[PDB]
Amino acid sequence: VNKYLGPYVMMIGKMMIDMMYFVIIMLVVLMSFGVARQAILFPNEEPSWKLAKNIFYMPYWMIYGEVFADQIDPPCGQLPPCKTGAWIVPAIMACYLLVANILLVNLLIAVFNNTFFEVKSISNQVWKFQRYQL
């Protein structure tokens, strides 16, 4: 209701659609890495819905901090002799970590900047509209 936080609420409501498009492109990259990960490392499991959790758990929290450094290239054959081609998993992960945490996020900074150019000139007067409603 207040003339200072009310515009920020409106700004969020405008930014969510750009966030949704960010989310869609983030799903396509994250699921690419997930389909890669839960197959090259795990080549011998029966149909189970648990795989579905694994295809979303491990890549998603890599975006927001922890990269799960203990679970990446585990010490092989010195300990079980590890998987089919499991050395490629750090390389494709490095590609995922980069594209995801740099390109799309930084583009979303730019998106937010231009939309905040657009909606700041709106903001004070549209509060002056919404005031009437209450």
The residues of the shown chain that bind a second copy, judged by CB under 8 A, are 4-5, 8, 11-12, 15-16, 19, 21-22, 24-25, 28-29, 31-32, 35-36, 38-40, 42-47, 51, 55, 57, 60-62, 64-69, 84-85, 88, 90, 92, 94, 97-98, 101-117, 120
Tokens of 91: 């390389």
Among a second copy, ligand Y01, none, partner that 62 touches (CB below 5 to 8 angstroms by kind): a second copy
- The C-alpha angle 68, 69, 71, rounded to 5 degrees, equals 70
Q: Which does 101 bind (CB under 5 to 8 A by kind): a second copy, ligand Y01, none?
A: a second copy
What is the rounded distance in angstroms from the CA atom of residue 14 to the CA atom of residue 119?
8
Least distance to a second copy from the beta carbon of 80, Å? 15
Closest CA to 22 of 125, 81, 99, 83: 99
Rg (CA), the chain: 22
Residues that bind ligand Y01 (CB under 6 A): 23, 26-27, 30, 47-53, 55-57, 60, 73, 76-77, 82, 87, 90-91, 94, 98
End-to-end Cα separation, the chain, in angstroms: 8
